[PDB]
Amino acid sequence: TTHVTATGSITLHFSTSSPQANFIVSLCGKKTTCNAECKPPADHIIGEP
Amino acid sequence: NNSGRPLQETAPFGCKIEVEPLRASNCAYGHIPISIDIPDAAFVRSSES
């Protein structure tokens, strides 16, 4: 959840498995497509599931 | 009497030759591969910046 204003932007954070960020983000009931090339992590191991 | 001139005026790449120990200072040649691990606390989350 976030605050919102008449105009502005939200810098959201996300985690994704697909190398393309091709996913429909829903904001406050609206739906907007987002996509970009995601790269493989620099570190092959992470302490989180 | 016929030694030729020293390397300080003959060493290439502008390196200033120095003694005790014999070593070449400020050499300028090629490139240096560098890797740096940085503590993640030095960065900030994209939403904070």
Are A39 and A22 in contact by the 8 Å Cβ rule? The answer is no
**Residue of A2, A9, A11, A43 to mutate, testing the B interface (most B Cβ within 10 Å of its Cβ):** A11
Structure-token match 């691990």, residue found: B37
- Chain A residues close to B47, C-beta within 8 Å: 11-13
| Structure tokens belonging to residue B25 | 């200072």
For residue B21, which amino acid is it? P
**Torsion sign, CA atoms B32, A42, B44, A34:** positive
A13 touches A5 (CB < 8 A): no
Q: Which two tokens stand for residue B34?
A: 């560098």
Best CA proximity match to B11, nearest among B20, B22, B1: B22
Q: Which residues lie across from B24 on neighbouring strands?
A: B17
Residue B19 CB-density burial (10 A; 0-12 exposed, 13-18 middle, 19+ buried): exposed
B30–chain A nearest CA distance, Å: 27
Residues 9-28 of B with CB under 8 A from A: none
Are B26 and B16 in contact, with CB atoms under 8 Å apart? Answer: yes
> Given in angstroms, what resolution was this structure solved at?
4.0
